[PDB]
Amino acid sequence: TDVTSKVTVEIGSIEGHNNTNKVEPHAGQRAVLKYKLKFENGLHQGDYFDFTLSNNVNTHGVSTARKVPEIKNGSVVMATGEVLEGGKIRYTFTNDIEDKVDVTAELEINLFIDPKTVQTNGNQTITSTLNEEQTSKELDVKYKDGIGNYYANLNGSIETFNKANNRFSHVAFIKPNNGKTTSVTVTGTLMKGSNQNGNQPKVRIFEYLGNNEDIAKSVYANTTDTSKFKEVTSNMGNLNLQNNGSYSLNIENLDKTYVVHYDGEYLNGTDEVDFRTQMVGHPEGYTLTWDNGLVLYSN
Amino acid sequence: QQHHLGGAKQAGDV
């Protein structure tokens, strides 16, 4: 049975990073949902309750696993959680709820600002709604800007991190600024995580066809949108892929913004990947170096 | 002047 109506939020709060009213997702920061819940008596194994998070956050961030912490009384698992569709979290009770009296439980869940839904700096109201009770927090969200010079800006973001299968994905934006750059070489290197005995990464190259103002400050690239991203991987003799996870790419004319999407493996036993993108450019030479790393959090 | 370096970190669970 849906027993959402049987759950009281005794205490509910959302906090920014380091109990401030701000989150800087490109500095690996997150927000936190804290619940103290009361449950009416008479619940059973398989009964469940839901709450819903605003679409500006999720519970995974760069991770591909969609998990949520168990509700426990001591070491006893009272309910297990799942991430469902549209911001919904559902907790389903175990046999240990049966015949218990005056049950309460504490839940703490890390909330990661979603770069697809929060694409620019701004104030975001984060909400968690359980049984009509809305827990709310206005947070400042601020992103980084990449690294630039007179001729170009280089930026990038880890898109996914898949621990279970030892794979990650990453996107880099290579953007011209003023003057004319030729003979650009762009490289990607695993600074931590390279598997010398592995497979070559899958590297796709895209022309960005939109305006520069509309590039998400969050760093998000919907590369399936062929109106925004024109794949030119095939046009590009100019791409060298290595079994250690590295690539090098030559762009002859940086007359527009290029996007490199990378999908590769990393070495078993590596806690976290560190990925470096470096660009060398020639005005009509300079280097831009951009590092992407990870900050991983437990519930 | 000729070489600039920066970086970022993404958050996620685990």
Residue numbers in the entry:
A (entry chain A): 195 to 430, 432 to 479, 489 to 503
B (entry chain C): 4 to 17
What does the paper say about this structure?
The adjacent fibrinogen (Fg)- and fibronectin (Fn)-binding sites on Fn-binding protein A (FnBPA), a cell surface protein from Staphylococcus aureus, are implicated in the initiation and persistence of infection. Here, we solved the structure of the N2N3 domains containing the Fg-binding site of FnBPA in the apo form and in complex with a Fg peptide. The Fg binding mechanism is similar to that of homologous bacterial proteins but without the requirement for “latch” strand residues.
The rFnBPA(189–505)·FgγC complex was solved using x-ray crystallography. The FgγC peptide binding site is located in a cleft between N2 and N3. FgγC forms an additional β-strand parallel to the G′ strand in N3 in a β-zipper interaction. The r.m.s.d between the structures of free and FgγC-bound rFnBPA(189–505) is 0.81 Å, confirming that binding of FgγC does not induce large conformational changes in the individual N2 and N3 domains or in their relative orientation. The translocation of the N3 G′ strand is the only significant change. In the FgγC-bound form, the G′ strand “wraps” around the C-terminal residues Gln-13, Ala-14, and Gly-15 of the peptide and interacts with the N2 domain. Tyr-501 and Asn-503, which protrude away from the unbound rFnBPA(189–505) structure, form hydrogen bonds with Gly-222 and Asn-304, respectively, in FgγC-bound rFnBPA(189–505). The combined buried surface area within the rFnBPA(189–505)·FgγC A·C chain interface is 1880 Å2.
